[PDB]
Design a protein around this ligand. Structure first.
Ligand SMILES: Cn1c(=O)cc(CP(=O)(O)O)c2cc(F)c(N3CCCC3)cc21
Length: 269
């Protein structure tokens, strides 16, 4: 509204310096006030689906109790590049919950693919997001192919506004049962990969859970987070980037700066 107008110039200058596109949607869950910048444009999800993948695994777990406990066996073939946890448990296998934790907190690529299989593949995760009223989200492909981040390709994309709206439902709304909800929040709170992104703009005395995504091409990287400032309502926000050239580099500093501007535009500072 009027807060989106305030931050337009600062965002324009930030993305001009970055040399690509920044997408931001930030919601004050108390006032319902919002900051938007390219909030309805598609950006590649990269690893950021792994968070919604974990919440879909949890949603299913509310039907079939013992799902989270189920051991999963896998071979060397499952181990696609950046599977830092699953590669340690190849000879033993892991449970669904451990794969979910690995996928959210270490962004583990084998773990994601193994969990995708369990839900009916990318169409299965998409089906879950449709069920919580997200008509924007689409996953099409698997790790690593979903990372192509091809300009104008809608495959494996969502919008910052849909990402924030869906995150609010799954972390703070009624989309999950309270146990699965608090479990989702706790995997996000325990994320190890986001220290240089939204977390870098969040004071140390505020709770935060996040999931990162990094495609490795087209300056395409992102983060979404729930943030619990002290003595005010939680903030939910999504910060997505991409860039026009394949060889363009992503910037964690740009994501952190975009998060600062979002929080500043909401006046939470
Ligand atoms: C370059 N780079 C990172 O910096 C961080 C991450 C972790 P996250 O931010 O995604 O959660 C990362 C993940 C990949 F799968 C990745 N591949 C590069 C080729 C295809 C994907 C690079 C990554």
């Amino acid at each position: 509204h009027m807060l989106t107008n305030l931050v337009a110039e600062p965002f324009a200058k930030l993305e001009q310096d970055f040399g690509g596109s920044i997408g931001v949607y930030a919601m004050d869950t108390g006032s319902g006030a919002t900051v938007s910048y390219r909030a309805e444009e598609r950006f590649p999800l990269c690893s950021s689906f792994k968070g919604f993948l974990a919440a879909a695994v949890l949603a299913r777990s509310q039907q079939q109790a013992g799902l989270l406990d189920t051991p999963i066996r896998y071979g060397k073939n499952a181990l696609v590049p950046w599977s830092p946890i699953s590669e340690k448990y190849l000879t033993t296998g892991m449970t669904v919950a451990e794969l979910s934790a690995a996928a959210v907190q270490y962004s583990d690529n084998a773990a994601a693919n193994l969990l995708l299989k369990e839900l009916g593949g990318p169409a299965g995760l998409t089906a879950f997001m449709r069920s919580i009223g997200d008509t924007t989200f689409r996953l099409d492909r698997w790790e690593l192919e979903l990372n192509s981040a091809i300009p104008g390709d809608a495959r494996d994309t969502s919008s910052p506004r849909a990402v924030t709206e869906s995150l609010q439902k799954l972390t703070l709304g009624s989309a999950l049962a309270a146990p699965q909800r608090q479990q989702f929040v706790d995997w996000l709170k325990g994320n190890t990969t986001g220290n240089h992104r939204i977390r870098a703009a969040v004071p140390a005395d505020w709770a935060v859970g996040d999931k990162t995504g990094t495609c490795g091409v087209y300056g395409t990287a992102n983060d979404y987070a729930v943030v619990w400032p002290t003595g005010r309502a939680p903030i939910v926000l999504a910060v997505y980037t991409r860039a026009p050239n394949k060889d363009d580099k992503h910037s964690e500093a740009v994501i952190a700066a975009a998060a600062r501007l979002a929080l500043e535009g909401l006046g939470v500072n």
